[PDB]
Design a protein around this ligand. Structure first.
Ligand SMILES: [Cl-]
Ligand SMILES: [Cl-]
Length: 162
């Protein structure tokens, strides 16, 4: 199991513009296009990202191209963030994937606000971090996914994904 397979499971694949769980325009493998309620706005954004006249649909390849870009952006974002880097550095490989999952989904900024949770992860207090992570809107809005990520952190294994 690797991060790509992991995210591919959590986000799914869609080749046509869709709304996410929060009503935003997304496409491919969780690639957010825009928050904005405007479909053209979305449409525009897509053509601009792909670089062609998409007509709100893209190929598999395009979807994976964007996915590689987003996962790389996530890693670099973490590696560059004064709050996230130390946590990431402190973790084992499996658990690092879980931190990348969160960033992909909520952004570095979203993640950087889980202050307490971050601190507990850093002290390797798995059970406690798991509890704290669960007291969040994130968990309440996407519980099943939040749970998979949380178990990943609690255990250090890919069981939640097998
Ligand atoms: Cl809560
Ligand atoms: Cl969910």
């Amino acid at each position: 199991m690797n991060i790509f397979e992991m995210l591919r499971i959590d986000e799914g694949l869609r080749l046509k513009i869709y709304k996410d769980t929060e009503g935003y325009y997304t496409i491919g493998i969780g690639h957010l296009l825009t928050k904005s309620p405007s479909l053209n706005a979305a449409k525009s954004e897509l053509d601009k990202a792909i670089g062609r006249a998409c007509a709100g649909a893209i190929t598999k390849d395009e979807a994976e191209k964007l996915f590689n870009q987003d996962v790389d952006a996530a890693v670099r974002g973490i590696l560059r963030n004064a709050k996230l880097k130390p946590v990431y550095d402190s973790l084992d490989a499996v658990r690092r994937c879980a931190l990348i999952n969160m960033v992909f989904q909520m952004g570095e900024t979203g993640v950087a606000g889980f202050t307490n949770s971050l601190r507990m992860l850093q002290q390797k207090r798995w059970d406690e971090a798991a509890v704290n992570l669960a007291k969040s809107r994130w968990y309440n809005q996407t519980p099943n996914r939040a749970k998979r990520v949380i178990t990943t952190f609690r255990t250090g294994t890919w069981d939640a994904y097998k």
